[PDB]
Design a protein around this ligand. Structure first.
Ligand SMILES: C[S@@+](CC[C@H](N)C(=O)[O-])C[C@H]1O[C@@H](n2cnc3c(N)ncnc32)[C@H](O)[C@@H]1O
Ligand SMILES: C[S@@+](CC[C@H](N)C(=O)[O-])C[C@H]1O[C@@H](n2cnc3c(N)ncnc32)[C@H](O)[C@@H]1O
Ligand SMILES: C[S@@+](CC[C@H](N)C(=O)[O-])C[C@H]1O[C@@H](n2cnc3c(N)ncnc32)[C@H](O)[C@@H]1O
Ligand SMILES: C[S@@+](CC[C@H](N)C(=O)[O-])C[C@H]1O[C@@H](n2cnc3c(N)ncnc32)[C@H](O)[C@@H]1O
Ligand SMILES: C[S@@+](CC[C@H](N)C(=O)[O-])C[C@H]1O[C@@H](n2cnc3c(N)ncnc32)[C@H](O)[C@@H]1O
Ligand SMILES: C[S@@+](CC[C@H](N)C(=O)[O-])C[C@H]1O[C@@H](n2cnc3c(N)ncnc32)[C@H](O)[C@@H]1O
Ligand SMILES: [Cl-]
Ligand SMILES: [Cl-]
Ligand SMILES: [Cl-]
Ligand SMILES: [Cl-]
Ligand SMILES: [Cl-]
Ligand SMILES: [Cl-]
Lengths: 291, 291, 291, 291, 291, 291
């Protein structure tokens, strides 16, 4: 039966996540709580967004995503709960997840609940939504919420009510689209025949380097598997390799691989060695690619 | 059905916790195991105590708390199993947890099982207890326990029998109050109009600063929300701010907030910035407060 | 209910493990997923092996072990799925796990599923096996597997089918013994009457030192409890103590203990203090022992 | 005998400084070379300036100051050689250096030779000058200067000729005042009645904190010895103490002292303990002071 | 002609030492200033003492030792100036320094000038003294000394007057023996046949380990070259080697050597490898030796 | 008059270098001791060689180079003293050092004294020699040398006698060429049109990267200033730039410069930024260059 997938900035160094889970099991006795991750940089909504955007196609229909970083905790702000539209295919190629031909997911089958602070920006961009509500009903949140713990009060608790079958439309008033806070997503720019983006993430624990340059950005340049690329990082450290599906395509252990990661984005790595860690490469460094 | 909430010093870098879990599912097939945390400083009973004392009000009645750091592993020592009295309200204000008016918890509704080494000191202080037993019966522990793994043998295994409905009074003989080991809890001193305590913890991953000065100590001084405080850390850092419910009350990002944390304790932080990390503030540093 | 115990190198800093879990619940709705650990050094098959070899006796019969580090992801390689023979006793002494006299486990009661890259080397050595198959059927893996995520495609997904009762023999063709990749396990040598091995691991979070010198290597050498030992580490740092069952046997806090760990191997520690961390002792350092 | 006092960014990890010295003795055999320091942050002209501005009153008349960080090495740029006017009193109080009443120094008694890159900015501001020349004559520099070693070619070599009595006016053409490159010296601001500046330096090896708030800024603001001050660092860390002449005035070891350093600037310290190091205080952090 | 050997806690990261030197050349134009070292832990008089006690036999007669760490700077304290008695033999064996049979040094041939804070404790112990004066005359120190720079005002400046031939007896009044401040030197204990001391120092940059167990303590036990020793560090590291004159006597590179250092003290090292650095051995650790 | 340039592995954290200097002034009262450097990695003869090979052309004729790392201290080995032949031009271009056309140095004008352990390998290679002697005479070394301090006994002391005019041929017997120990100098290899060497050094404090690829190696490939080069480091981090005389030729601050350093070797840097430090580039990394 019901699943809550829980992504927070609470860490795993104290009992904070367990407090939320205790309440989730209290409210929805049959629930399964799946940890997404609790290690994001606090208050970094763009990073939290990366951990939650790709999730729906992996989960059983009816799954509730409880997703929180809440620096405006204790203020008059209230969470947003949305039923997304498209589960959405994903991966380097763009497909359903699972055995055989994959598991097709029906539309309108997932709910996200989150602070209304832009955390859901890319979820809404990539999946769309069918309905959105402000979370205000004392049936689903505390009458006297703990000031410093709104992720528990305004996300974990109401997520468990939704998992327990509390009607989404009863959590509070519908929100107009402009009332849902979004963050600005920096565009990949074309610079002659080059594409210019950033390092979006270091892929821990491996030290692979992920960029914000999407497959679609490459397809738009006619760059496909086999293309010899020059990928320049930090505007000083350059790299040369063909675009390949995987790490082993580089040949010898330690050789440079340029590939599409499992999220659909242009990435660079060493084959069975860490690229990022020895050279201290970091998120936010410039990333330029050209054939 | 049954829940075991599991707090240990085992970490999550090998299969130790999984070994305990396997045995829990072996003994109580329908159990749900909830991780509290496994990252405590080993052998620091005062720190372990902080991760378990606030738990009961969050959990369904009948939950068993399996809580362990066991430096006396492999000796003639035996664990203690206690049925607590008051589930106890908590928070900055002192309330039940949950939506609406919160979930009131019945008395005598939770069991803790732990080494008899002081780990349960504050649990017993804040909740009281109705009965306490030494854990000795070969029905609930190994006849030949692994010398170096008493958290598994003397806590995890018998917790699962308890969760499965093994009668608490049958784990072994009743313990008199003086036979339950306690650690000394240093008091918050009165020093004129001031209060003198310590930094109890750095609140990871945020770098908030928690003190052992409780709301009840503040009340003794008549310090309420709105009072302008000087909070001096480490003897030399006279921070000045009013006592506010939350971080955002400090105004601009990075401004100092003095507040009551979600555990009921006087704390200090910066608004959506880390206080402790840039200046390497630490547990054990002195903390003085005055109006 | 069915259990999957999941060991990977995916870490816990993003949604990787949760994607695997989502698919596990999709395929086998009544499953319980137990995390073994996700923190292993990527691509270190010998380390991964250490985290999985001791598991079976702790788990209910029918448990599926999904175990992966997959540096050959996206290649023509296919996973191996084996039903092990002996659940196998373990510990410092060699016993069944659990309360009373322990829980005996029937033969042929556990499946491991893993990359065919040597990860299962010690599992097969210590437990033996009844049957082994290559994992190829589109009924249990994707027809179009994600190139960079074979742990999910070729381990997590099929493990969930096996947990749901998919016949093991139907995953693909039987593998001959020589077709199952092994790593070389470096032997404990004798230099005269000294036993010469290595530091196999630092036991986090404690800083205990584990060697690859097993109880049986000691028995062959005529060393039992009470024997005064000289244990030399890194060909530099000497330590002297009798062989004892546990840490507290050393007397005062900080005193050296030489002992058999819970996995059955010669180890060294300080009593309730860290040995490894102050001296920066490491996995791979030489370890020599003599009576 | 002639003295060259030598300040560079060359460090002391190779033979760089010794190459300069060899040439100094070659050109001026009776010279004494005094190391000022060689550890400055490379290319940080403001830091280099701090190490040289206070020197003249300490040295015998006729001393040549050879002072260099040379990031424009190998370009068409040429060094500037100046004879300063006032030797200038210094210290917390403003006095001549030395025993008795100190050693008065005659005007026009010192030469500085440096890259024309702003290094001499504060030297000229605090001392003034009588004459300034561009260093171009092949009598005092190489006809074929080493491209990457202009500190040696254009500072060390000519300084040795000047020490040996080569007429200053013969090194090259006179420079007009506007032709001498200056850096902007960021002013101490007033925010109401608070003086607002920066941490100018960490005083190694002690971990004292130096600000750019000078004795005269204090005098203008009506602050003298005995005044109770609140000094805030990094817009976060507050400290409170009276202004005192020295560290021991703070009382117990570890107590906060706010003082005028030996260069005449407002500074903060712990009495015989490091302030900066435990709190990781740094150059460039804001510093605010108020009575 | 005259030599001042200068040891301070001033470091070499700014112009502090250069300021002292300028004043030395100002007062005594023909002086040679020799840096002893400037890198001592500030305020650690025992460490400063180790850098100056072995000096006299290496220097020409008439050398002045200017030696300073001055945490009491700016108080009513005044330096002490002493003419030592015995230049004293030194080394592992106890000999004069130099070629041939060494350079015998006359008695009463060296002056030390230092804060009266215990810095000269071991100088006076090992050399004795013939006369001692408080440094007060405005002929040799500033009438208005810089409060925060007493090493310059009360040591460097008067050292230069002394080097210039200013009569020692004229610096101020004679001091009685009890007026010369000393630090306590912990003894090397006899413990059965064993000797119990400490690690006095890590010998940088090699990472050799020096003890406070002197050749004369070894002689008391009849421990000579060739004796097989157990040297235990930090309480738990029973190193075993014969006492040898030098490192290479240990044989293979990396082997343990136990030796008498160039200062006369029992020490331990590896042959052409670092002992202290890999295992983070430290000053203050216990050191026990027995045959 | 006489100069001794002193290069050792003694560091500057204690009085070791000062002990040697004391003796140098004792033996040769008129001497000037110039520090080359004391910070080399102990026992690394190849590194020590780099700090001393380029020195002669900078120093007055008659200069004695006292150069030591002595891991065979206390053994029967004895130092070598050589009169070199060619002073040798140097730099990126190959010229005399100094003002005007530079200072031409006569042949046979410099002596090196060093352990006979290969330290002088490159000195002898680049300068040649006219005579070489084993240093054994009790007129120039101690009759009873300190076992652990042969750099003082067998280098510093006899260097001072040579500076004082002791006849070189009287220090001991002449050495045949094969009796002078040399280290192996790895060749730069041609790999098609590429040159393959190593990173010889990180140029501290700047973080420039120096290779063992000489100007002559470039001239041999017809690579001159202006040539577009691809310089690959560590076999993964590549770089592209024209060969230029200096850093500023790169344009903007932070741009990659490929140049000939002041020692004559192909090097790579960022313009007024550190290359090595952010990417943790190190000595011993591969360096490949191609036009
Ligand atoms: C050794 S740990 C068990 C997990 C370990 N990774 C293993 O596989 O054996 C078990 C218990 O021993 C205690 N322990 C661990 N190291 C210890 C030490 N050096 N001294 C005393 N107790 C220790 C811990 O607090 C814990 O309660
Ligand atoms: C304080 S944390 C609650 C867990 C905490 N360990 C506890 O036991 O109370 C709750 C929320 O506060 C936010 N938060 C934490 N520290 C903050 C700070 N200094 N400023 C703004 N928000 C903060 C976090 O993002 C999180 O969403
Ligand atoms: C890339 S990780 C998948 C999780 C990743 N964070 C993601 O979202 O795509 C999948 C498998 O690839 C392997 N892997 C990761 N980096 C690798 C590299 N640089 N070379 C070879 N294999 C690698 C890992 O061992 C793991 O089994
Ligand atoms: C290269 S350093 C000379 C010493 C060096 N160790 C050598 O032997 O060649 C000479 C001058 O170049 C400057 N310099 C060094 N690295 C630089 C860089 N990457 N960009 C600009 N200037 C630099 C320094 O400031 C210094 O003044
Ligand atoms: C401040 S240092 C002088 C050099 C400093 N860089 C300057 O320019 O003023 C002078 C003396 O003060 C002492 N000193 C430095 N910091 C101190 C502190 N925080 N407390 C007590 N003494 C200190 C040192 O031991 C030294 O003897
Ligand atoms: C011991 S150091 C002398 C300085 C030392 N700080 C002292 O006061 O005695 C003298 C010589 O010993 C060599 N040395 C130092 N430690 C060594 C070791 N562990 N093995 C071999 N040689 C060593 C060094 O290279 C140096 O040339
Ligand atoms: Cl929260
Ligand atoms: Cl345990
Ligand atoms: Cl994977
Ligand atoms: Cl330079
Ligand atoms: Cl001083
Ligand atoms: Cl030496």
């Amino acid at each position: 039966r019901p699943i809550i997938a829980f992504m927070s900035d609470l860490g795993t160094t104290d009992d904070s996540v367990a407090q939320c889970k205790g309440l989730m099991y209290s409210i929805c006795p049959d629930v399964t709580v799946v940890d997404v991750c609790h290690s994001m940089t606090p208050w970094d909504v763009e990073e939290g967004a990366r951990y939650i955007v790709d999730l729906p196609r992996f989960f059983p229909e009816g799954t509730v995503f409880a997703t929180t970083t809440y620096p405006a905790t204790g203020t008059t702000t209230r969470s947003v709960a949305v039923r997304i539209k498209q589960a959405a295919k994903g991966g380097a190629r763009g497909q359903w997840a699972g055995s055989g031909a994959g598991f097709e997911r029906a539309e309108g089958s997932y709910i996200y609940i989150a602070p209304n602070n832009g955390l859901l920006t890319t979820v809404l961009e990539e999946h769309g939504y069918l309905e959105a509500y402000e979370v205000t009903s004392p049936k689903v949140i505390p009458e006297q919420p703990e000031p410093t713990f709104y992720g528990r009060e305004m996300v974990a608790i109401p997520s468990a009510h939704l998992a327990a079958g509390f009607p989404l439309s009863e959590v509070g008033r519908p929100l107009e689209d402009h009332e849902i806070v979004r963050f600005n997503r920096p565009a990949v720019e074309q610079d002659g025949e080059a594409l210019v983006g950033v390092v979006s993430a270091i892929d821990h624990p491996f030290g692979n380097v992920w960029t914000n340059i999407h497959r679609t950005d490459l397809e738009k340049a006619g760059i496909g598997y086999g293309a010899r690329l020059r990928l320049t990082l930090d505007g000083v450290l350059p790299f040369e390799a063909p675009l390949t599906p995987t790490f082993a395509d580089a040949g010898e252990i330690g050789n440079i691989a340029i590939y599409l990661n499992s999220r659909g984005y242009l990435s660079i790595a060493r084959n069975a060695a860490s690229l990022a860690y020895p050279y201290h490469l970091k998120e936010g460094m410039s990333a330029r690619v050209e054939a």
